[PDB]
Amino acid sequence: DTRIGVTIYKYDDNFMSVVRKAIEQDAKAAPDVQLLMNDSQNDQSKQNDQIDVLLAKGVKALAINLVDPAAAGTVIEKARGQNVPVVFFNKEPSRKALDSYDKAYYVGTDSKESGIIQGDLIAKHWAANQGWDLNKDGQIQFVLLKGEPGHPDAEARTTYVIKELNDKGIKTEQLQLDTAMWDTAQAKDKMDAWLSGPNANKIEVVIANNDAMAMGAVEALKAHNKSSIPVFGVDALPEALALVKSGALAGTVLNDANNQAKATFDLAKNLADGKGAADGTNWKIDNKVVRVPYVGVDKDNLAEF
Ligand SMILES: CO[C@@H]1[C@@H](O)[C@H](O)O[C@H](CO)[C@H]1O
Ligand SMILES: [Ca+2]
Ligand code: NA
Ligand code: NA
């Protein structure tokens, strides 16, 4: 069988666990393929050693989810010896690293796109629901529940949901913005506080960096008899999708693990086979990179889930 080596930066990452399991399923549908999976345990030196072992096993391609993005060059140098193609995924190597090797590719999507996609989703519903503009000023008076401060996804989603609304011509007024640390109960408490203070009747839209915090806000709104205020999240968790179905959550955003896995596997398998990376697929490779869009989820596409 054609051997393909895969390294996951750490097995205790939820998103990468979904991606890993999807890669494993995809490989099961390719009987000519033997997948050699590795948990790098959040240690780049461990990952580097795991790559040494993979290469001694004659892998025909490497799919590498780096612990340290700066280690791309190190990995490429190992791959060169046997001219093994490398499909980096989820952690983006530098442009210089990708351009250094004719058989280096990347599959992944900037975190800021989750904010952009969430902003577009909010814009979509805002425009379709002019009654949401409670004070009729043409601006969204919002509150924002932020993930852990300094976490790249908290920072990206917070910055870019507002930038994208504003860029789409929708002025916003930030009535409150605080962290609830990705947590449902913390978010419920924070939203409760806001609904008990001077801004209670001014809030038009609740924006959360994830579904957990969105759901806490949903509960707080219900308790204050303000369920008519729309709430938006990110993650497309099943318990959140249940709320999209019931109308309690206005929308959420999928980080598309299945398609990250599929593009990674498809490219790796083609490259292992000595074929063009996108041969027989509909992936768009743009200067060695496949971007996998975040997807806004609401009542239009909910049946797909
Ligand atoms: C473990 O912390 C994770 C965070 O890394 C992820 O981006 O977003 C998640 C929120 O759904 C957090 O629970
Ligand atoms: Ca308004
Ligand atoms: Na991403
Ligand atoms: Na609501």
The answer to whether the annotation marks 95 as part of a ligand binding site is no
On whether both 299 and 288 belong to a single domain, the answer is no
Domain of residue 99: give its range: 1-109+256-293
Q: Residues 162, 60: one domain?
A: no
Atom of ligand 1 nearest to the CA of 153: 7
Do residue 197 and residue 231 come from a single domain?
yes
Strands of 231-232's sheet in order across: 172-179, 140-146, 205-208, 231-232
Residue bearing the CA closest to ligand 1, atom 7: 153
DSSP string, the chain: -EEEEEEES-TT-HHHHHHHHHHHHHHHT-TTEEEEEEE-TT-HHHHHHHHHHHHHTT-SEEEE--SSGGGHHHHHHHHHTTT--EEEESSPPPHHHHHT-TTEEEE---THHHHHHHHHHHHHHHHH-GGG-TT-SSSEEEEEEE-STT-HHHHHHHHHHHHHHHHTT--EEEEEEEE-TT-HHHHHHHHHHHHTSTTTTT--EEEESSHHHHHHHHHHHHHTT-TTS-EE-SS--HHHHHHHHHTSS-BEEE--HHHHHHHHHHHHHHHHTTS-TTTTS----BTTEE----EEESTTTGGG-
| Domain identity same for 99 and 32 | yes
Residues 6+ apart with CB under 8 A from 24: 35, 37
Alpha carbon of 244 to those of 30, 148, 225, 232, 250: distances in Å?
36, 25, 18, 10, 6
Residues 231 and 160 placed together within one structural domain of the fold: yes
Per-residue CA distances from 23 to 28, 218, 230, 264 (Å)? 9, 34, 36, 8
- Å from CA of 221 to ligand 4 middle: 7
When computed from its CA atoms, the radius of gyration of the chain, rounded to whole angstroms, is: 22
If asked whether residues 125 and 230 sit together in one domain, one would say yes
Secondary structure of residue 200 in the 3-state scheme: coil
- For the chain, the domain total comes to 2
Q: Which long-range contacts (CB under 8 A, 24 or more apart) does 183-186 make?
A: 183/212, 183/213, 183/216, 184/212, 184/213, 184/215, 184/216, 185/216, 186/213, 186/216
Same domain membership, residue 54 and residue 128: no
* Angle of helix 14-28 versus helix 257-272 axis, rounded to 10: 50
Q: What gap in Å lies between CA 42 and CA 182, rounded to an integer?
A: 22
CATH of the domain at 103: 3.40.50.2300
Query: In 3D, which of 56, 28, 45 has the Cα closest to residue 265?
Result: 28
Task: Give the span between the Cα atoms of 119 and 105, in whole angstroms.
Answer: 29
DSSP state of 198: T
Burial class (CB in 10 A: 0-12, 13-18, 19+), 265: buried
Q: Are 220 and 298 in the same domain?
A: yes
Atom of ligand 1 nearest to the CA of 234: 11
Task: State whether 124 and 263 are in the same domain.
Answer: no
| Residues 265, 112: Cα–Cα separation, whole Å | 24
Q: State the distance between the two ends of the chain, measured CA to CA, in whole angstroms.
A: 34
Reported resolution, Å: 1.7
Considering only CA atoms, which of 46, 45, 43, 82 is closest in space to residue 62? 82
Q: Are strands 140-146 and 289-290 parallel, antiparallel or unpaired?
A: unpaired
- Pocket around ligand 1: residues whose beta carbon is below 6 Å from it? 153, 182, 210, 212, 235
265 and 188 in a single domain? The answer is no
- Which DSSP string do the residues of 35-79 spell out, in sequence order? EEEEE-TT-HHHHHHHHHHHHHTT-SEEEE--SSGGGHHHHHHHH
H-helix or E-strand containing 122? helix 112-128
The ligand that comes nearest to the alpha carbon of residue 204 is 2
Among 42, 112, 118, 151, name the best residue to mutate to test ligand 1's pocket (greatest count of ligand atoms within 8 A of Cβ).
151
Query: What distance in Å separates the CA atoms of residue 221 and residue 228, rounded to the nearest whole number?
Result: 8
Asked whether residue 92 falls in the same domain as residue 159, the answer is no
- Ligand 1 pocket test target in 153, 179, 186, 255 with most atoms within 8 Å of CB: 153
Burial category of 182 from C-beta neighbours within 10 Å (exposed 0-12, middle 13-18, buried 19 and up): buried
CA 1 to ligand 3 centroid distance, Å: 31
Specify whether 128 is located in the same domain as 247.
yes
